[PDB]
């Protein structure tokens, strides 16, 4: 893209490299939310995603991660403070690869996010969609296999490294 940043996660399984997932961040349409994710991916504010876990992976639905503060699925922090408002609902959860914000109700975006592995239309208008997997959907599909019905993972799936491309 000429406008939208690309960021990457190097995914690990119990510390071993699984592969790289890259994301287009839709700064063109969802700028504040895209910028939060971009900055958390580079670590440039002094904190961010590197080292954090995909704590909830449910096959057929999504891979969720992004808690770098409590490290247990309850934490979250944005570059704007602990939470920020729902920016817009222009984009929908249309299929695999969609990148969207996790939340605890209206206007509670922090750092947790999820990657859809299927269309999740019941989340439209409730979770802010702000990007999509560019390359490495096969790696997301490999991650999905470590999940279970209640989201607990059979091995620890982490963001071993992350950053911005070009």
């Amino acid at each position: 893209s000429m406008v939208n940043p690309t960021v990457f996660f190097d995914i690990a399984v119990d510390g071993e490299p699984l592969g790289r997932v890259s994301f287009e961040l839709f700064a063109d349409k969802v700028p504040k939310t895209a910028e939060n994710f971009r900055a958390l991916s580079t670590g440039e504010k002094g904190f961010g995603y590197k080292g954090s876990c995909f704590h909830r992976i449910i096959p057929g639905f999504m891979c969720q991660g992004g808690d770098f503060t409590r490290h247990n699925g309850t934490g979250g922090k944005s570059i704007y403070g602990e939470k920020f408002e729902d920016e817009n609902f222009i984009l929908k959860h249309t299929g695999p690869g969609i990148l969207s914000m996790a939340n605890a109700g209206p206007n509670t975006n922090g750092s947790q996010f999820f990657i859809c592995t299927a269309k999740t239309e019941w989340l439209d208008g409730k979770h802010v969609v702000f990007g999509k997997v560019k390359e490495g959907m096969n790696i997301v599909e490999a991650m999905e296999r470590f999940g279970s019905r209640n989201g607990k993972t059979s091995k620890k799936i982490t963001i071993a490294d992350c950053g911005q491309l070009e």
């Binding site: 909830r56 449910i58 247990n72 699925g73 309850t74 019941w122 019905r149 209640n150 989201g151």
Partner: protein, 170 residues
């Protein structure tokens, strides 16, 4: 004798549904919040001299997913409706759970127990009398619990079984 009961634990997020269940099944309590998607447990107990297997479904406080939650409610025989004594919103949510259970089961007489959890904490906002009055209005028992100290945990689950047994007598 042996019997078996399908118990379903419902209530708003964070009220202690899982902590209560884990005390019953695993005899411990931890301060860490591990949000539920869905968990199921089995335990053999003796209640009023009658042995039974408890099949416990620990549900999430999540508010959507009506179709999946209706399925929980069709299969469940009795419901622990949990609120936290320091969370008034969770108490105000109780009537929604009762209404949905009655609709799904197509009955105004469904085995249920009202549980006021976290009674160990000094931050109460719902007093015992409001909860007793609500339970009286539903014709159901009210049990105060603390998953942290284990106060009332067995009583809550055993009382629900008693409610199921009474309902089966009708």
């Amino acid at each position: 004798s042996m019997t078996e009961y399908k118990l379903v634990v419902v209530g708003a997020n964070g009220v202690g549904k899982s902590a209560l269940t884990i005390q019953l099944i695993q005899n411990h309590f931890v301060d860490e919040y591990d949000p539920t998607i869905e968990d199921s447990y089995r335990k053999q107990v003796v209640i009023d001299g009658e042995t039974c297997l408890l099949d416990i479904l620990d549900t999430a406080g999540q508010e959507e997913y009506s179709a999946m939650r209706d399925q929980y409610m069709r299969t469940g025989e009795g419901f622990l409706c949990v609120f936290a004594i320091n969370n008034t919103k969770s108490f105000e949510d109780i009537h929604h759970y009762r209404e949905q259970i009655k609709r799904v089961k197509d009955s105004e007489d469904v085995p249920m127990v009202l549980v006021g959890n976290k009674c160990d904490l000094p931050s109460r906002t719902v007093d015992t009398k409001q909860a007793q009055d609500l339970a009286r209005s539903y014709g159901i028992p009210f049990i105060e619990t603390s998953a942290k100290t284990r106060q009332g945990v067995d009583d809550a689950f055993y009382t629900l079984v008693r409610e199921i047994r009474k309902h089966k007598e009708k």
